[PDB]
Design an enzyme around this catalytic site. Structure first.
Site, PDB file in Angstrom:
ATOM      1  N   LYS A 110       2.316   1.131  -4.399  1.00  0.00           N
ATOM      2  CA  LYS A 110       1.024   0.322  -5.049  1.00  0.00           C
ATOM      3  C   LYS A 110       1.326  -0.133  -6.233  1.00  0.00           C
ATOM      4  CE  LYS A 110      -3.078   1.857  -2.098  1.00  0.00           C
ATOM      5  NZ  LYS A 110      -3.834   0.474  -2.084  1.00  0.00           N
ATOM      6  N   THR A 158       2.757   2.508   8.634  1.00  0.00           N
ATOM      7  CA  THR A 158       2.282   3.554   9.363  1.00  0.00           C
ATOM      8  C   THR A 158       3.262   4.515  10.115  1.00  0.00           C
ATOM      9  OG1 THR A 158       0.056   2.951   9.357  1.00  0.00           O
ATOM     10  CG2 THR A 158       0.432   4.682  10.770  1.00  0.00           C
ATOM     11  N   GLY A 194       0.941  -1.166   0.179  1.00  0.00           N
ATOM     12  CA  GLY A 194      -0.078   0.024  -0.098  1.00  0.00           C
ATOM     13  C   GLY A 194       0.834   1.152   0.184  1.00  0.00           C
ATOM     14  N   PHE A 212      -8.254   0.415  -3.456  1.00  0.00           N
ATOM     15  CA  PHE A 212      -7.480  -0.308  -4.470  1.00  0.00           C
ATOM     16  C   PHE A 212      -7.410   0.627  -5.857  1.00  0.00           C
ATOM     17  CE2 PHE A 212      -6.769  -4.225  -2.389  1.00  0.00           C
ATOM     18  CZ  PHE A 212      -7.908  -4.482  -1.503  1.00  0.00           C
ATOM     19  N   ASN A 242       1.558  -7.790  -4.157  1.00  0.00           N
ATOM     20  CA  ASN A 242       0.266  -8.199  -3.506  1.00  0.00           C
ATOM     21  C   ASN A 242      -0.814  -7.948  -4.617  1.00  0.00           C
ATOM     22  OD1 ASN A 242      -2.459  -7.313  -2.286  1.00  0.00           O
ATOM     23  ND2 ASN A 242      -1.005  -7.367  -0.334  1.00  0.00           N
ATOM     24  N   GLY A 252      -1.544   1.300  12.308  1.00  0.00           N
ATOM     25  CA  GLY A 252      -0.772   2.199  13.330  1.00  0.00           C
ATOM     26  C   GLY A 252      -0.893   1.445  14.754  1.00  0.00           C
ATOM     27  N   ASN A 281      -7.623   4.619   6.112  1.00  0.00           N
ATOM     28  CA  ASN A 281      -7.703   4.711   4.823  1.00  0.00           C
ATOM     29  C   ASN A 281      -8.528   4.100   4.196  1.00  0.00           C
ATOM     30  OD1 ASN A 281      -6.676   2.366   2.649  1.00  0.00           O
ATOM     31  ND2 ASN A 281      -5.660   2.212   4.767  1.00  0.00           N
ATOM     32  N   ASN A 310      -3.698  -6.973   7.797  1.00  0.00           N
ATOM     33  CA  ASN A 310      -4.172  -5.861   7.002  1.00  0.00           C
ATOM     34  C   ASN A 310      -4.831  -5.033   8.279  1.00  0.00           C
ATOM     35  OD1 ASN A 310      -5.200  -4.191   4.831  1.00  0.00           O
ATOM     36  ND2 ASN A 310      -5.220  -5.999   3.862  1.00  0.00           N
ATOM     37  N   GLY A 354       1.062  -1.984  13.275  1.00  0.00           N
ATOM     38  CA  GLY A 354       1.600  -1.154  14.352  1.00  0.00           C
ATOM     39  C   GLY A 354       2.975  -1.300  14.920  1.00  0.00           C
ATOM     40  N   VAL A 366      -7.349 -12.031   1.715  1.00  0.00           N
ATOM     41  CA  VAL A 366      -8.494 -11.989   2.088  1.00  0.00           C
ATOM     42  C   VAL A 366      -9.160 -10.683   2.056  1.00  0.00           C
ATOM     43  CG1 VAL A 366      -8.594 -14.051   3.277  1.00  0.00           C
ATOM     44  CG2 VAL A 366      -8.622 -11.797   4.669  1.00  0.00           C
ATOM     45  N   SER A 367      -8.341  -9.647   2.231  1.00  0.00           N
ATOM     46  CA  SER A 367      -8.701  -8.775   3.525  1.00  0.00           C
ATOM     47  C   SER A 367      -8.675  -7.261   3.418  1.00  0.00           C
ATOM     48  CB  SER A 367      -7.526  -9.029   4.587  1.00  0.00           C
ATOM     49  OG  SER A 367      -6.331  -8.865   4.244  1.00  0.00           O
ATOM     50  N   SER A 368      -8.719  -6.517   2.347  1.00  0.00           N
ATOM     51  CA  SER A 368      -8.958  -5.369   2.139  1.00  0.00           C
ATOM     52  C   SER A 368     -10.394  -4.908   2.794  1.00  0.00           C
ATOM     53  CB  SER A 368      -8.956  -4.828   0.928  1.00  0.00           C
ATOM     54  OG  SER A 368      -9.555  -3.352   0.746  1.00  0.00           O
ATOM     55  N   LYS A 402      -2.931 -12.867   2.867  1.00  0.00           N
ATOM     56  CA  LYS A 402      -2.992 -11.871   3.795  1.00  0.00           C
ATOM     57  C   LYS A 402      -4.415 -11.945   4.493  1.00  0.00           C
ATOM     58  CE  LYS A 402      -1.696  -6.920   4.457  1.00  0.00           C
ATOM     59  NZ  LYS A 402      -0.786  -5.942   3.464  1.00  0.00           N
ATOM     60  N   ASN A 404     -11.884  -2.338   2.104  1.00  0.00           N
ATOM     61  CA  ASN A 404     -12.351  -1.032   1.098  1.00  0.00           C
ATOM     62  C   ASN A 404     -12.906  -1.725  -0.200  1.00  0.00           C
ATOM     63  OD1 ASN A 404     -11.719   0.632   3.326  1.00  0.00           O
ATOM     64  ND2 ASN A 404      -9.597   0.442   2.797  1.00  0.00           N
ATOM     65  N   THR A 405     -12.909  -2.878  -0.337  1.00  0.00           N
ATOM     66  CA  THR A 405     -13.801  -3.296  -1.417  1.00  0.00           C
ATOM     67  C   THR A 405     -14.813  -4.259  -1.181  1.00  0.00           C
ATOM     68  OG1 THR A 405     -11.837  -3.043  -2.826  1.00  0.00           O
ATOM     69  CG2 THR A 405     -13.381  -4.496  -3.924  1.00  0.00           C
TER      70      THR A 405
HETATM   71  C1  FMN Z   1      -2.549   4.037   3.125  1.00  0.00           C
HETATM   72  C2  FMN Z   1      -2.466   2.529   3.411  1.00  0.00           C
HETATM   73  C3  FMN Z   1      -2.953   2.075   2.343  1.00  0.00           C
HETATM   74  C4  FMN Z   1      -2.638   0.475   2.196  1.00  0.00           C
HETATM   75  N1  FMN Z   1      -2.969  -0.240   1.122  1.00  0.00           N
HETATM   76  C5  FMN Z   1      -2.687  -1.394   1.268  1.00  0.00           C
HETATM   77  C6  FMN Z   1      -2.958  -2.581  -0.121  1.00  0.00           C
HETATM   78  O1  FMN Z   1      -3.000  -1.929  -1.295  1.00  0.00           O
HETATM   79  N2  FMN Z   1      -2.722  -3.597   0.143  1.00  0.00           N
HETATM   80  C7  FMN Z   1      -2.710  -4.345   1.226  1.00  0.00           C
HETATM   81  O2  FMN Z   1      -2.543  -5.407   1.268  1.00  0.00           O
HETATM   82  N3  FMN Z   1      -2.539  -3.723   2.275  1.00  0.00           N
HETATM   83  C8  FMN Z   1      -2.650  -2.396   2.355  1.00  0.00           C
HETATM   84  N4  FMN Z   1      -2.252  -1.832   3.378  1.00  0.00           N
HETATM   85  C9  FMN Z   1      -2.173  -2.289   4.807  1.00  0.00           C
HETATM   86  C10 FMN Z   1      -0.875  -2.464   5.167  1.00  0.00           C
HETATM   87  O3  FMN Z   1      -0.235  -3.240   4.143  1.00  0.00           O
HETATM   88  C11 FMN Z   1      -0.867  -3.072   6.409  1.00  0.00           C
HETATM   89  O4  FMN Z   1      -1.187  -4.349   6.511  1.00  0.00           O
HETATM   90  C12 FMN Z   1      -1.325  -2.314   7.781  1.00  0.00           C
HETATM   91  O5  FMN Z   1      -1.541  -0.738   7.382  1.00  0.00           O
HETATM   92  C13 FMN Z   1      -0.683  -2.418   9.198  1.00  0.00           C
HETATM   93  O6  FMN Z   1       0.581  -2.241   9.111  1.00  0.00           O
HETATM   94  P1  FMN Z   1       0.917  -0.633   9.822  1.00  0.00           P
HETATM   95  O7  FMN Z   1       0.324  -0.454  10.944  1.00  0.00           O
HETATM   96  O8  FMN Z   1       2.353  -0.869   9.859  1.00  0.00           O
HETATM   97  O9  FMN Z   1       0.567   0.331   8.870  1.00  0.00           O
HETATM   98  C14 FMN Z   1      -2.562  -0.064   3.440  1.00  0.00           C
HETATM   99  C15 FMN Z   1      -2.290   0.468   4.715  1.00  0.00           C
HETATM  100  C16 FMN Z   1      -2.311   1.829   4.600  1.00  0.00           C
HETATM  101  C17 FMN Z   1      -2.072   2.481   5.858  1.00  0.00           C
HETATM  102  O1  ORO Z   2      -8.119   0.908   0.265  1.00  0.00           O
HETATM  103  C1  ORO Z   2      -7.001   0.163  -0.060  1.00  0.00           C
HETATM  104  O2  ORO Z   2      -6.526   0.371  -1.062  1.00  0.00           O
HETATM  105  C2  ORO Z   2      -6.559  -0.844   0.937  1.00  0.00           C
HETATM  106  C3  ORO Z   2      -6.419  -0.500   2.027  1.00  0.00           C
HETATM  107  C4  ORO Z   2      -6.013  -1.205   3.289  1.00  0.00           C
HETATM  108  O3  ORO Z   2      -6.021  -0.640   4.391  1.00  0.00           O
HETATM  109  N1  ORO Z   2      -5.883  -2.425   3.082  1.00  0.00           N
HETATM  110  C5  ORO Z   2      -5.952  -2.915   1.695  1.00  0.00           C
HETATM  111  O4  ORO Z   2      -5.689  -4.129   1.596  1.00  0.00           O
HETATM  112  N2  ORO Z   2      -6.262  -2.311   0.703  1.00  0.00           N
END
Ligand code: FMN
Ligand code: ORO
Ligand code: 1EA
Ligand code: ZWI
Length: 356
Positions: free
Chosen positions: A64, A317, A61, A113, A145, A266, A109, A244, A295, A177-179, A215, A181-182
């Site tokens: 991307k 984060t 993320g 995607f 990813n 975070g 966020n 995630n 985090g 599995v795990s966004s 994931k 936001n879709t």
């Molecule tokens: C702005 C943002 C965008 C992200 N986009 C993706 C994504 O496209 N695919 C994904 O698998 N995880 C995405 N994540 C999740 C991170 O990969 C991660 O699993 C999650 O933020 C926890 O780690 P952190 O607390 O160190 O940020 C995103 C996270 C953030 C903050």
């Molecule tokens: O919105 C995305 O693109 C996104 C955010 C996020 O937190 N995790 C993820 O897998 N995708």
């Protein structure tokens, strides 16, 4: 630099720019190598027989679209994960779609995607494919990813397309599995999807054949976790990425924006992710490698995940609050802790809380 970024530059920059603009700038700064540039042998890890110079990766993320990979290695990450990448380009959600929670050391966020799509990413990675082979050989692997398009009716086929197009450019692939936001994100259907993904992977020529990881969310039920562990073992899925972002809102969040829709990342996520790692490690009998994420901002945070069962960790984060110097900080701190606690290296600490 660590103090300067954390206390002055990053707070000041937060003031000037909205977080998405800041992210875009960061990806352009990192692509340009506007960074300074050995890791201890203690930090080396072999996971599935493959070397990682250090166990600290950049989570999906941030990059991307695969624009900043070399810059991320320069920043000190032992491995890089790009994506999520969707088969066709898509814009994602309307802006604003990223929100800071500074009082919580958190972000919410709902990017949705946003992706340049497989073809653009493929050509970007091809431009540097041999360079990546050398990096991987030198202990600096690349993960990709894979996501699905918003309007796809066949999720498995989106993932299969991603395996075919980007698998040959990757050390590992990730199926979320795990966004959060879709829209749409039983055990028989999970098995069906993964079987297809694995069959596609298995069809790639050996030099071009990546590992496949799943994931997961922090928000799964106990039943869901049992079911994932069961499928992963049955099919021989290579690893898990845990976790995630969360769609929960833990009690005590203070940020004004806490009730925004999206995934929370975070500090508020950290222990929920660690506990998920601990559970997945136990459910898979320590036999499935885990990349622990959620985090991580310090060496203690990293070690806690490792001792819970992670072979590797990622962060995202923390960079947003501390800047690039956080990577070195986490790795110095982790090395120091491993020595204090009597571990020979990272490897010896993996799953130590469980008693091995
Ligand atoms: C702005 C943002 C965008 C992200 N986009 C993706 C994504 O496209 N695919 C994904 O698998 N995880 C995405 N994540 C999740 C991170 O990969 C991660 O699993 C999650 O933020 C926890 O780690 P952190 O607390 O160190 O940020 C995103 C996270 C953030 C903050
Ligand atoms: O919105 C995305 O693109 C996104 C955010 C996020 O937190 N995790 C993820 O897998 N995708
Ligand atoms: C992580 C990060 C590093 C930055 O600075 C540098 C980047 C590369 C090289 C040197 C400095 C900067 C600059 C350029 C303003 C910004 C960020 C940054 C900040 C933020 C932010 O919240 O301000 C951010 C938010 C996200 F949701 C995702 C990524 C983000 N990245
Ligand atoms: C599980 C956590 C990630 C593990 C990393 C695995 C990296 C493996 C892929 C390397 N590449 C070059 C793509 C294929 C080699 C296949 S092999 O030669 O049979 O090893």
């Amino acid at each position: 630099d660590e103090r300067f970024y954390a206390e002055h530059l990053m707070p000041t920059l937060q003031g000037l720019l909205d977080p998405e603009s800041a992210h875009r700038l960061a990806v352009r700064f990192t692509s340009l190598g506007l960074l300074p540039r050995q890791d201890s042998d203690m930090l080396e890890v072999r996971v599935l027989g493959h070397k990682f110079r250090n166990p600290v990766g950049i989570a999906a993320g941030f990059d991307k679209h695969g624009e900043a990979v070399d810059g991320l290695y320069k920043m000190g990450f032992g491995f890089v994960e790009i994506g999520s990448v969707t088969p066709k380009p898509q814009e994602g959600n309307p802006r604003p779609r990223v929100f800071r929670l500074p009082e919580d050391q958190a972000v919410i966020n709902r990017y949705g995607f946003n992706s340049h799509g497989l073809s653009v990413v493929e050509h970007r990675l091809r431009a540097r494919q041999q360079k990546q082979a050398k990096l991987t050989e030198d202990g600096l692997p690349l993960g990709v990813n894979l996501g699905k398009n918003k309007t796809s009716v066949d999720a498995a086929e989106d993932y299969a397309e991603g395996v075919r197009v980007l698998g040959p450019l990757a050390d590992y692939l990730v199926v979320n599995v795990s966004s959060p936001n879709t829209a749409g994100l039983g055990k028989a259907e999970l098995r069906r999807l993964l079987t297809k993904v694995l069959q596609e992977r298995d069809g790639l020529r050996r030099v071009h054949r990546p590992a496949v990881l799943v994931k997961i969310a922090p928000d799964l039920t106990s039943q869901d976790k049992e079911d994932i562990a069961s499928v992963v073992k049955e099919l021989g899925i290579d690893g898990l990425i845990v976790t995630n972002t969360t769609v929960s809102r833990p009690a005590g969040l203070q940020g004004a924006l806490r009730s925004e829709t999206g995934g929370l990342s975070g500090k508020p996520l950290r222990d929920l992710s660690t506990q998920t790692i601990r559970e997945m490690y136990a459910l898979t009998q320590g036999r499935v490698p885990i990349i622990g994420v959620g985090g991580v901002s310090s060496g203690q945070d990293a070690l806690e995940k490792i001792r819970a069962g992670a072979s590797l960790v990622q962060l995202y984060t923390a960079l947003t609050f501390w800047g690039p110097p956080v990577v070195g900080k986490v790795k110095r701190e982790l090395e120091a802790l491993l020595k204090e606690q009597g571990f020979g290296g990272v490897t010896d600490a993996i799953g130590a809380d469980h008693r091995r």
